[PDB]
Design a protein around this nucleic acid. Sequence first.
RNA 1: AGUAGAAACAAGGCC
RNA 2: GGCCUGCU
Lengths: 716, 249, 735, 121
Amino acid sequence: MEDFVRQCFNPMIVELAEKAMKEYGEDLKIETNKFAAICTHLEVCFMYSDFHFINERGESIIVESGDPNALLKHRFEIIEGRDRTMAWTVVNSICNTTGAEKPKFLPDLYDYKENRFIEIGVTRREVHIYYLEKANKIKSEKTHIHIFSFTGEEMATKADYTLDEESRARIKTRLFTIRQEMASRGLWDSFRQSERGEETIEERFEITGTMRRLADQSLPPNFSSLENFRAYVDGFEPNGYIEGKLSQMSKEVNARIEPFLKTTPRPLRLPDGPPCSQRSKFLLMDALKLSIEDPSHEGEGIPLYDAIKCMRTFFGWKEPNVVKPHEKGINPNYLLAWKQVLAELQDIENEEKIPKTKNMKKTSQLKWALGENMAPEKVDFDDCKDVSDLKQYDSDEPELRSLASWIQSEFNKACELTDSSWIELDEIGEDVAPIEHIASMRRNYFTAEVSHCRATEYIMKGVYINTALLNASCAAMDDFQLIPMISKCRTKEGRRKTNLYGFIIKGRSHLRNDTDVVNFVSMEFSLTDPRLEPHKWEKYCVLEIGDMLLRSAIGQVSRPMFLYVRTNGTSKIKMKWGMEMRRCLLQSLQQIESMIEAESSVKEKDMTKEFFENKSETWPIGESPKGVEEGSIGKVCRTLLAKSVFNSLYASPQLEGFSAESRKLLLIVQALRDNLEPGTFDLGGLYEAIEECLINDPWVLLNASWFNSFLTHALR
Amino acid sequence: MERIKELRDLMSQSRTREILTKTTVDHMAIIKKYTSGRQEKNPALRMKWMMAMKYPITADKRIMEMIPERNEQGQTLWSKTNDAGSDRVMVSPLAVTWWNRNGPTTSAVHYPKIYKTYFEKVERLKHGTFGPVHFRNQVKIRRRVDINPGHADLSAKEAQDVIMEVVFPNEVGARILTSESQLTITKEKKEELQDCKISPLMVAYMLERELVRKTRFLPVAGGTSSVYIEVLHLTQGTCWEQMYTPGGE
Amino acid sequence: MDVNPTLLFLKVPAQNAISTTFPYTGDPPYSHGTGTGYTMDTVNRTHQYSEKGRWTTNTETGAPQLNPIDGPLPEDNEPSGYAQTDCVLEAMAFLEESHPGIFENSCLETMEVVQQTRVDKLTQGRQTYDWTLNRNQPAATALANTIEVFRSNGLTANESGRLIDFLKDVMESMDKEEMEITTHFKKKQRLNKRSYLIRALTLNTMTKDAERGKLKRRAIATPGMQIRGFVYFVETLARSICEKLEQSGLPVGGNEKKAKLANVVRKMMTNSQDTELSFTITGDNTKWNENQNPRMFLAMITYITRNQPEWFRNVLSIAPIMFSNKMARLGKGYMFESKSMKLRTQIPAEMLASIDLKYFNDSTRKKIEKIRPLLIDGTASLSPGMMMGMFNMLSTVLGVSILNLGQKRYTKTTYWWDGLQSSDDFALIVNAPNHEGIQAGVDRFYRTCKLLGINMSKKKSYINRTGTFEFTSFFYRYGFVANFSMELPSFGVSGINESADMSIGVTVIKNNMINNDLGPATAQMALQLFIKDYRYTYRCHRGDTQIQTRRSFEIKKLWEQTRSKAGLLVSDGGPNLYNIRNLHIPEVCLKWELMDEDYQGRLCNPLNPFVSHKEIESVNNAVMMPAHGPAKNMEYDAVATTHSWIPKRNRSILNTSQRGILEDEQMYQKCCNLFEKFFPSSSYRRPVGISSMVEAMVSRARIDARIDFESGRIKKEEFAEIMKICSTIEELRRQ
Amino acid sequence: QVQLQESGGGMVQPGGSLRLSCLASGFTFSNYAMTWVRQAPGKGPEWVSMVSNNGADTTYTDSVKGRFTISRDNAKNTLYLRMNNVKPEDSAVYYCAKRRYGGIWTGQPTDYDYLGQGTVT
RNA sequence: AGUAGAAACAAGGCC
RNA sequence: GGCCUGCU
């Protein structure tokens, strides 16, 4: 039958009908009479629509061939011959522009004169039944319907026929051409009734070929095919198989509970080796401040001018000389770098306006100090294979180092009060609710407690230094840059003040990965002699740069004044995390506020004021040789703030591992102290897990010592 | 006019012609998401790192013909170098602030009508009345509650057809909404937003947010009302209760 | 006196101050170089935990595979992957018996979803291993490349737009003699059957960074695109199953997890009378993923899908069949340094099979020597067990089956147990009349776990009396206690954009106040610090200050120009009006009534060249990877302002041979923008159909010109011009 | 009713420090905003500074930024003011004040209810 | 040298 | 010496 559509109809219509065939997903080889019927429907749609044009009037202009002009409007514009999505697109667009009603089924054409749709259907059966059939299929329709049938008859409601009658003679001539051409073909044994509305399909997902063999190799050891295994599974029913293997399984497979008593836990062993060194990016306990007493705010001002003005406030400069060498570098380079920094600072002082940011010369001194041109050149393996020295990067456990007493004192003095306010908080919306007033009062109390704390000063120092370093690295990637360490505080009298700890020289910072390292050299003034705790300054070079006179009742001290100079490095991640050190304030004060709220849930009243003023209640916050010492809530605030600050400063994988594996043991010990009969399956394994995190970090070793002390004081 | 004209210009060049011809409508989404740009793992680190560069943000090419290349002192506002995989050009953040001090101005009177949810929140809070804070242990029990206080009793898909018919009336397809509540919602949000020119996509998104009901599991103590859950952070705490009555009531 | 914070625990219980034990204020550990060492170590460890299995050689991939299932029962407490098929089938049968109709229903909904799912659902995924280029690429890019290759090779069933048809094409590709791929350096290369099989069965290995809570780094894996559809269907089934199990806690959030934990502890302890003792085990499973054999997941799913259409069973079984034969790419490689000659070199991992061992240290030398026998075409066969939690939900199902197997109806003894399982972590409440009963119950639970290939970490687990325990960093002590140290890293600028960052910060403060019991004063301090960091990050200072920045001039002139300066946004150098009462309001709407109409109009102008919206999914959704958890998405309330710009892209593609991808990106985006202008609903609802672009665009041009004349700007001249231009593009597409 | 006194007034050399003080009674001191206005000899008064009921939102004149600090104490019902590095032309009589609204920004900044007994030169 | 820690950075590539 | 890139 398909030979007929090969022969007669034009290409355009046959591929339109083929795409309509693909539309609903049925195959053309099984039933083709539908293809012919609907392609004839589509053909009558065209032949009825084309050759029919309109101009600004009604009364369509009919031309056998559209002449070249702007007057190519089509009388009837076709609906079908398009995908369902576009057919409904045209339906909705016509409804929204023509203000007509939206039909629920697919029309075939639209006309302007009568401003409505045409649903053309030419069926094998006579018209006077198919018409009202499709009419009762369509609900309350104003779209006019018109149908032909092979006998040659026409019909329509309203007795309406919308265009010329010679066109309809055309239609029925086409119709009988179709008819008495099948006459030569002979199809009416099924042509009248060949489609009955079949819609059914079964989804087929068959495993075959290579993928089947893979299925045959992904079974238990004693199975040969997926078919057999699935049959076995379907036939499988529970018949007490877990019990049999449990009985047969060796009894050494057990989870015996070892009781956890007061005498069970042993102190954590600390590693032994050379004392632990300093790792901070700046001096914490041994910092010195040169000040100007200016009225500018933290960010307000220009760095270089402030630094120069602060440094001019000090008199007593001496020619620098080596006091304590780096022990691994070239100290003369550090000396020359310091003198170069001074010289270029003067050079800025001379000229017209202090630059906002200064670049330094790339001398051999800072070329060595900043580690320039030291990365091995990257080459290909095929060119370097016979080199005996060629091997992997050194990948082994870090060097072992024992704890020293300097970190303990540094933390002790990091929780001490100061003679300045190191936090100038921002603005918030004016409090409107009583709860907001309570929150503001609490916040004011904590700010009064923690602002005068060395932890806040360290927070500001780190934030400013890391912000400046990151910005300089991102801006001046190539050229070495000078950045004075600046921090602005407020005195007890209320006068604002600036403080200059020293200088940082940032080097080449072409940082691609988050782990890539930018090297800088840090110089900081101090008065602490490095000849008393040399092991804490393994990586520092310390010079003697001047003498300071601070008013004291013992005449006047006239102390020496040294310069701690070192080469340090950071990374994008480290800079970003060090510039978010202000969340240590959060951590600490959230803990304290949780304490206050928990206690106030007992007594139905806010308990902040008496906690902060009466200072009757105290918490164990340290141990003295006499015994455990307790301090007021403010001291707890400062201690927790210092702990968070040191966590942010000495952060490392060792800290995370020890924190987790020691929190586990802390929970076990707490369960013991709560009389909850705690038990363990392998306590030695937990101890070994904790002890492997303690390698060389001073902070984690101090935490381990604190944990041992807590165990000793606990378990009683 | 224009649209078909850049269509013809695209089809003029062979590669885009092939892309238009062989690519089917269904694959639309795939090729639209086809990109070499990986999704950032650490957005904060790079936002703090990129903002230290010059020309850290991106803007459409049209910026080159509305904002001058430099400001009064000569600080550059935009660059003509296009982004990696787009025709947009990289520009400095000042071009934002500049646009807020001398850029073109319009009538933003209809934004309150579009962003109905946020302005309703503001109105509800502005007329609220606070009360005394009572300090006592709160037994916070976890419950499933509806957070959206303006949901019109419609699901995501249920209101999606409404949203299309309100914004994209022609792409609705087969669906013609039966429920009369949807009829009235369509009528109201059609006559209300008849000429709003913010964007079809944002209008649809905000209509989805407003009409679609959404639910989440939260620790609550008292309240349980939609209007009382948006301020759950302000009325309920660990050991304090703050009596509150939104402006709606 | 020496200060010691830990001594604070002598007065404050450990859980009431547990936040102090979370050093989440410093930089988390990161990996620096290759992850090849970790990948090799994981492969060797997975293979040696199942050493007593039986060896075979796959006839298709030619790789050695180790099957430990039904192997000898363990005789020691060391980890073992010798799961027994009959035991696990019986466990699943008991799970079904205790929950009748679970499998049949879940299979019904899964069948519905599978037969109505679309291909585009695969684009909604993070990095995936594209085999066309042998590298990780965004899910959409890899899917597009694979579809292009399939269409070039003759597999065009995916044009039906159905994920099931895409999987049919994927499987049909397995039986092809020779496929063709494209490489740029374009060159067409031919892949034989075995090479393509291994490329489709392989995984890409990387090192996990930003992982807090352990000293050593780990390795993670990413599969290809051929196997992700089957994984999607299997995980859909597993999620539908677990949603019907109250003992599971994987498909829920955190608060739901806490609620279920409280309910189970109350149920276990309350029902226990005075005579019965109760004990809670806070258990962690050692080597959870390395001991889960994909064959056992195949067994579980084929038991689940019994009495179901065979096509459903086949499509759900394809995934574990491929995992059982999965291969793993070793990794980036190894970098060597020579200090004598002062140079460095980078050898790819694919050379580990043949490269001499003189360059490697003792540990790496031994690892390579042990893993070499499993090396096939630069990748190692990893049949014995899963690599990194790809089947999270099925593992949770197995754990829930174990938990339910002690409902006192199967124990047949006075003791019994229950609890909650979330993959790699569990809480087990066991009750028994005497300590001997508790010991016997825990021993039998451990033994049954060892029969299913699941091991309990004795070093990271402990048992106490009920009332105090831990679960996924949630510490329960007669009621869950807030931590607030897990969410600390999320208190900074997110890094999306100005408005997005502001809204996300305020919303995070609000949420942590609601959930994590953040205090009022602490919340105010957090708001202040966040505002400070936000202003210092975006160079948007108050405007009344003299802080010179790259943006302080325009901000200052805008400040001096504005009359009501209280309405200026913090992004434009205005005061901050936020407070505890205003944390749930966007900044634009909070300052709407205070803004000057000129500034208000300039700010919220639709014609701004900065705002760009792509799809309904990416309107106000921000992907923030939370600390100590999987990547998560958040809805943030924000108004589309001129500050909603999107930041610059990487731009490093210009120096790589893969430079043509940018031109393809630009052309695809131009075509997509044209289509959207032709089809406005393209973004909100993704278009569907089987026609091509130009057909729809030209036909809609026809119709829209027509109707927009029937009322609108068009004119006959223009309408006819459009009609004949449509004809012109038609004949152009003809040729 | 409204009661406002002054203190600390006294002659002083330039470039020196000084601290003023005030006092209130008859109303909720922690519920209303304050300002400081000064009348120079032969010149109308103008505003100097403002402050809110929280102690948080402070502003200043254009010509005295960084040299004047303002701070209140609700408990003792006072309102301090510290001026350092005083300019020569700063010599004049200073007048306390009391806003009506709690905030500061809304409305124009001008004195409404006070009397400036205190002075300085 | 320095950062850092089971492998890396201490710029890369292209002419 | 000149130019390109900074998660590809």
